[PDB]
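PT: before anyone asks, these are the final sequences, not the draft ones from last week. 1290 residues across everything. Please model them as a single complex and drop the result in this thread when it's through.
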Amino acid sequence: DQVRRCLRANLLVLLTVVAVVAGVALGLGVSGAGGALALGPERLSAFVFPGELLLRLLRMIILPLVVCSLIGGAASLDPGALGRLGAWALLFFLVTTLLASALGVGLALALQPGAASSKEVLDSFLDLARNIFPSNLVSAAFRSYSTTYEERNITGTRVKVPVGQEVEGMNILGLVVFAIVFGVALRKLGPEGELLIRFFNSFNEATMVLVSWIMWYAPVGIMFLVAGKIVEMEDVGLLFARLGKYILCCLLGHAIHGLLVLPLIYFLFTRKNPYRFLWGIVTPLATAFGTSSSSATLPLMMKCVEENNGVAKHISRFILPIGATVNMDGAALFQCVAAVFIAQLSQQSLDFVKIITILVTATASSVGAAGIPAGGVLTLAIILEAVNLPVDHISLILAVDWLVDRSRTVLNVEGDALGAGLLQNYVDRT
Amino acid sequence: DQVRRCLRANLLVLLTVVAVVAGVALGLGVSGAGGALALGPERLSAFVFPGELLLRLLRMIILPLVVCSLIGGAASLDPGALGRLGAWALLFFLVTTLLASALGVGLALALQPGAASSKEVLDSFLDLARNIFPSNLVSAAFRSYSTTYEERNITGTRVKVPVGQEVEGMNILGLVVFAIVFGVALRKLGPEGELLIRFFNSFNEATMVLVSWIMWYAPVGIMFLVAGKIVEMEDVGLLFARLGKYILCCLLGHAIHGLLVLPLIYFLFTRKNPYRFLWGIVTPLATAFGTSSSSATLPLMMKCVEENNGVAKHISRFILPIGATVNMDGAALFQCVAAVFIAQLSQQSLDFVKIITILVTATASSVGAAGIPAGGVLTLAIILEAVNLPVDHISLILAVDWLVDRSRTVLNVEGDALGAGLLQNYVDRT
Amino acid sequence: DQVRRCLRANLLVLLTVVAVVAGVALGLGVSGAGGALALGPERLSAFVFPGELLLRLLRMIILPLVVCSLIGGAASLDPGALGRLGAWALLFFLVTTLLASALGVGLALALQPGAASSKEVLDSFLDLARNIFPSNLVSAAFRSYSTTYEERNITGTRVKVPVGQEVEGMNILGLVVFAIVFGVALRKLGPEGELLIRFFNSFNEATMVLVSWIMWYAPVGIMFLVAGKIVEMEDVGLLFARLGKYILCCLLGHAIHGLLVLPLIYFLFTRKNPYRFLWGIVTPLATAFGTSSSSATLPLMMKCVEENNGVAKHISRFILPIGATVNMDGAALFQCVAAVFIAQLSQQSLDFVKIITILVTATASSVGAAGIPAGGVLTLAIILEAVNLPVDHISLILAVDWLVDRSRTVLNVEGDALGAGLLQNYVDRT
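LR: through. Structure below.
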């Protein structure tokens, strides 16, 4: 038949959807009883197991991935050899990614989906800053910093005085700064650093096969993961509603971002109608919402932005190819919204500095996740394990990533499309 | 004289035998008193010391050795470029190594030598499986996983519920799987992995000199080690008997393996007389029991297996050279028997999953220990420290490795000799 | 003006002196009140902070620096290809560095500056020796060994019996031996080690830019460091006196070393007047006390030692260039005196084995600190963190390193100058 073509080509996505349709079914069948058929937590602790094995594979693969990939991505950057006219594009990409992430965490905090049913002082900024630059780069790979208070009982009966120590679970946040500074150092070293860069970049592809094989294992892990998850909550008529509120929340966040904020930076700078520009460029968005692929939509988008509202004719070949892989605004929006939704689902007591380190770490990792096909879930697990949040809920987000991803794709092309529709004045207005 | 020739050539073995003949003597002289001449444990804790220093050198050298050597030994394997006719030879080598190790642990458990004078449930398989794929590859280098039980006191007064944490002492077992998957990944990456393979293989010879120098230090360490060991037991008329029972046990295990099990796989597949084949190939076994060297006996063995019972004339040049360094059945037999003998000598309470991880880890490390001349003791220390067993008793095994090694050599050539006498039917019977 | 020339060229030293002149001033202004304006320890724990951030950067940079630099400095050494006539120069350099360090710790212990206002037995040598060769090279990067005593209560009521465990804070001392043996192993491996040496040496320059940038950050860190330090002591009329006693102590140690000990090894071997030799070579010392630079003073010194007291005419081109970067006697003197002064200032209870590991570790690191311009403070922080001493007091030593460094420079040229004035007899007297 023709079934062999559509089987082997798109196999892993069919495997994970046929795994998750049973994972909801098996968890439904054992959730018909109240979490205990014959062994309540005992057989459950082994019934939940291969999803936990999948997370065990994911943590040991997200250590070397982030350190070697950010070394290879911070040695590659050459701001001197990229043009000041191109540098303002990077500035715009960074500020709109920060803006998208900020508004997304703001709206997800405002609606607070999922929540429907350690006293640390303001001086956690010192703990976060000490966690940025760690004590040594081996204890930084498995344990981060944390200050607990004791009582010296001086000047009265009690005094809340902080002692400082290192608690378990790594700091990716404190490691990405060292790897980025290492890549910048390898650039500034120059020709002696060629061997180290050819080492570390080759180390990255020596782990892309590893995450490829973990992706091959991923269906049975995600099936057992979501099965143990829905037998844990014991509320299907509410978890459906929590997931739907989260989905609607992040899609309307995508909508209000792409419909007001990029229009805000348009009209605040160009003072021309953004709606006429978008009405000019409807059809590559009509294929981005068709295919959901930022790679294949790029030639039609580059051809369209030159015809309607004629751009500077070279940045369409310069900033628009490179902007598709660096300004993924909707993906950063999705990751910052979804991680706050898990914390509001598990009641993890968000400090404001936890909001800052879920902002900036997921912001800098927006430029990644492009070589990895399912990098949106991988980077989400990265920023979950950077704040010691439960990665256990990632199956539910990966259960419904398609329905929101169809809308997430168009933000990532709308951003750099409007950036192409913005910097044409900087040779005119200057 | 002629003494300078036989001194410098074979020097280290003369050094360790003249060290161990004094180590039994000094421990005898201080064991004439009951473990306390003038300071019982106090001066003893410094009298025992340089053997513990030798073990301190051995652990810090067996970390990088196993990770870099298994990377260099899992990048080298090419099953696609080795032939399906050659692949069944690898299958046979693996199954006879597993069979030899299984029967050896079975018989050493059955006789239980040395023993003459933490309640963990069946769910340790999850602990072992989580210990296979670790959380991160830096905490995997010094500490493994272990689940302890506490009491939530829910549904009654007490409930044995497992919490999970990471206890000290590394998991080589959890590290060899990552290094092997890394080498396979470097193969599947191809030409970008050339720099990483030339890194990691060069790292191996950057530690073979290290174990050469630790071997140079080894005589005084093993002398003080066995001296502190025999003053610890305070029973020489029994420890002699325990060692003799162990020696007789492993040599008869070698005997029953090479006399029935390889005949079993012969007669079950060929249905021809194995004794006539062995009577044909007596004389290379007569030199293997002469010289005790698998390298030098290989040309005579390859010439002999073609004359008597004429083999397929090319696999003798293909599977018989490579089988001498990969199918070391008797060495794996020795390591799995000797490690169980130490645990039965120290009462280390063997779980069945400890039997599984002393089976399979020592099975996969049978292919090693060939470039290292005294690799039989090194791999034994590896599989002892992979299960947190006391490495302290390794002097007694290295005291008598010669007497059993004379018989251990002939198993390693008898195995692939009978494998050459087996796969000739697969072009005839097919 | 001409101010732009003297600004950009010597900028960092002007930055750190204008930072330290305010750091004494701000700490003076807040020390006018008794350590508490409105928040005693609470705002102080954040007021002290960026100096602690500077130390946080320094520890994570002194791990990879010492391991890669000593690999690159132990692979470079070739005693076979350096001449036995040149090897006695290395022997003399090592013994005069050990002698200078020994006399410096002796005199600094004898005067005991700064002190004006854990019972471990003699068996710490076993703890130090186990700390030399660690258990594994990942736990050796963040935690060292330490034996605590408990009571088995056997043979009486109590018995002080040592248990052994690993306590936090790395052992550089146990790591430098592994890196040095690794570099020697890479030499003895030869042409397969070329890739590893070109890796590790390139890794060194990939951290010299890192310590360059930490040096750029260093002024505000040292200002806040000394400001929090002088508000801690609350005694300026004594800390001035403690610092002056320390300065006078180390400068007179330099004086008595260069005026008696190198004359002692002169007259004990040559039996000629050392004062006539020094009166011959006054003027390169007059420029070394002028410029304070061992690099630029070397041609004038090499020309001067040949004219007055005519040396062997080739070792002046052989041992005198290489001796300027390996025999830094005064720097090792300074580091061993200053570290004992901190321990006598903080009452850190010096064991004799702590004197041994502050002797030998700082002795072997005298050959370093030459490529780093402010390597005298960096190596001081290294040998402070090798013995878990407080690095917190390093601002006061770096506050006054100039006043003693002016005298420290002449020892480093006086040593190898007198060594050139010594080995000329070994072709004459032989």
